[PDB]
């Protein structure tokens, strides 16, 4: 159960980062990170897939209700690979990922605010920031985490967000999933060299997941070892 919660994020992920690490500002604010970079990045055979990530909170006008909300330019595999359940609708095709449709995913709570009526979501349009957006899918949270006190959150194909309501080449991050059952330790340094190449400087700054995965795996199985062993010893004593 707990591993399924953990492996729910698969194998693996190398989110791309600027600056130095998590706490950095200006060097992290600047991003020499073309989404085009992914091309050659996706070119490596061991990789199964790798995906762009970006997000922007913006004001959202609508009919009468008129409030800002966070939003998330992402892959269509997002709710898929996260396995996030849908309140309604689906994610989106890669074709329409290229289609730049004004399709979009929203919080159920966001609907709770927008829609006292509980009107059907699909086919409806609501502007984000400025651009009109024909809402379709909305997804229920797959975690409780009530202490998070989650606010309004929204999801877009990244091509649309970063594209036709941002236009920057530099997305917040890029997920990178390896194939082959390949080890987390290896190649991440090779990708590091890769960023030492396609960029001229030490700018990978990425975090990684079979490291923490394998170690918590050894941890849990170790707990199995202690528990089952002392149990069986006691029973043999019986």
């Amino acid at each position: 159960m707990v591993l399924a919660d953990i492996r729910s994020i698969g194998t693996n992920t190398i989110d791309v980062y600027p600056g130095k690490d998590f706490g950095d500002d200006d060097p992290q604010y600047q991003q020499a990170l073309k989404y085009d970079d992914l091309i050659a990045i996706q070119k490596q055979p061991w990789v199964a897939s790798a995906t762009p990530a970006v997000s922007q909170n913006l004001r959202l006008r609508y009919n009468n209700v008129d409030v800002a909300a966070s939003a998330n330019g992402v892959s269509g595999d997002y709710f898929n690979v996260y396995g996030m359940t849908f309140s309604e609708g689906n994610t989106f095709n890669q074709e329409q990922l290229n289609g730049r449709a004004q399709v979009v995913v929203l919080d159920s709570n966001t609907r709770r605010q927008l829609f006292p009526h509980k009107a059907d979501v699909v086919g409806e349009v609501i502007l984000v920031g400025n651009m009109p957006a024909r809402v379709i899918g909305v997804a229920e949270e797959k975690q409780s985490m009530f202490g998070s006190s989650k606010v309004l959150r929204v999801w877009l194909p990244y091509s649309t967000m970063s594209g036709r309501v941002m236009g920057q080449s530099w997305l917040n991050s890029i997920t990178v999933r390896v194939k082959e059952g390949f080890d987390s330790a290896e190649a991440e340094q090779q990708l590091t060299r890769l960023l030492s190449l396609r960029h001229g400087k030490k700018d990978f700054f990425t975090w990684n997941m079979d490291g923490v995965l394998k170690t918590v795996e050894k941890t849990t199985r170790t707990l199995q070892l202690f528990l089952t062993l002392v149990a069986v010893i006691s029973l043999v004593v019986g």
Binding site: R61, D66, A68, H117, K118, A119
Partner: protein, 159 residues
Amino acid sequence: NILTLADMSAMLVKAQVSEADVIHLKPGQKAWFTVLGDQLTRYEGQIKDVLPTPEKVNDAIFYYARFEVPNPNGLLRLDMTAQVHIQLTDVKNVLTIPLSALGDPVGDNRYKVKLLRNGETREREVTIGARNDTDVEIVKGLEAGDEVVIGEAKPGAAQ
């Protein structure tokens, strides 16, 4: 610019109503306002007019409206913050449904269980657009004097 002057005997207000509601706001509608610093000391007057030219604050366009409050006592400093209640309408001889009881099927439909003279309760779909903080205005959908089940509403279920 050597100096500036202002006639402090009538304090015009800039009530920036949202663009979502500007379509209404018919002139001469009665409205009132109050300041944060005095908590409870209501001022009131007629709305005067609406400014043709909006000025945005990044997101969301807004449109101004003005009153003409008398200013004795010498109070009311310039550019003071002021909460504003602009009379939306004065509908009357018309029923309104308490929020707790109403059911809202589909996303437009509104079931409303009511007691009947038979003593057997029955829901009715009701059309409602206007709504208040405490109630939703029902111009149509329920015959007057019908009792309504404020709690545990159940269609087809006699009390």
